[PDB]
């Protein structure tokens, strides 16, 4: 239970230091990672309200031209199924996904937060069964953690995949590791609570996967930065393209990590730990594979719950 959020920087909030890690409002950076584009739209009218400044890279129209258009005009085919898929009241973790054939393929991911639709666009291009069975069949916690890390590494090609388990003081230990020789080994290494601060842990119980595809890439602003509906920040906790905390970006660069991704392990509604993945170079995992990893995280969570109850 951290101290309350600071305002974000663009609303005059303080820049974060090691004295106040937990107060960074990481869910409302007003910016995205440059491997995709993000638009926000009115949930009733479909008016495009905010556009990431790099949108032309992915959509072929400048932000100023996109802004003010409706999703009916921009996405004729998707808008009705979108209108049908995401009416008011739904969980903000609920997703609509589609593939757009853009002259070559864009993955569209849409979620609703209150009266706003958040649209994420990024390039896209029988083994899940075997992964699920492997996790189900592990007869003890050690075996389960080994299978989880090995399976995730196999599926993703990440240089290093670890299982990070939280202690009651919110310090953590890496208790399983699958890696390329000789990525630095963190197996058995322990880390302070502040490295994964309490507002991050809280967010990670609500939105179960997040990533930084390129730890040296500059964030791309949303324009306008505030949602015109509310004159308030746009909630991006459920957007995988959300810019990552600069403090964490620096942590990763200092570790020689070019790309990072984690998946929550949730037991009894608490953050038990994280599947922590690193690559030394930048690395973008395809959207469909992210969905697979989320499924694997849920399965892992349920198996950890099961095996701990048996003890
Ligand atoms: C004062 C602020 C600091 C800071 C804040 C911070 N950290 C995160 C997110 C993560 N931290 C993680 C920690 C580890 N990754 C590893 O490989 C190890 C051990 C070797 C540790 C301990 C992880 C896994 C994450 C999740 C994100 C990811 O998977 O890449 C945040 C939130 C980031 C975000 O979602 O935007 C914040 C604010 N970290 C510090 O050490 C201090 C300086």
UniProtKB/Swiss-Prot annotation:
Changing residue 247 to A: Binds PCB (in vitro), but difference spectrum is altered. A tetrapyrrole binds at residue 21. It comes from the Bacteria. Contains one covalently linked tetrapyrrole chromophore. Lacks the cysteine conserved in plant phytochromes (at the position of Met-247) that binds chromophore. An engineered sequence used for X-ray crystallography forms a thioether link to biliverdin through Cys-21. The natural sequence can bind phycocyanobilin and phytochromobilin in vitro, but the identity of the natural chromophore is unknown. Residues 140-304 form the GAF domain. Residues 23-91 form the PAS domain. Photoreceptor which exists in two forms that are reversibly interconvertible by light: the R form that absorbs maximally in the red region of the spectrum and the FR form that absorbs maximally in the far-red region. Also has a slight blue shift for the far-red maximum. Could also absorb green light. May participate in regulating pigment synthesis like the carotenoid deinoxanthin which could protect the bacterium from intense visible light. In the N-terminal section; belongs to the phytochrome family. This is Bacteriophytochrome. It comes from Deinococcus radiodurans (strain ATCC 13939 / DSM 20539 / JCM 16871 / CCUG 27074 / LMG 4051 / NBRC 15346 / NCIMB 9279 / VKM B-1422 / R1). The gene is bphP. The chain holds residues 4 to 323 of 755 of the full protein.
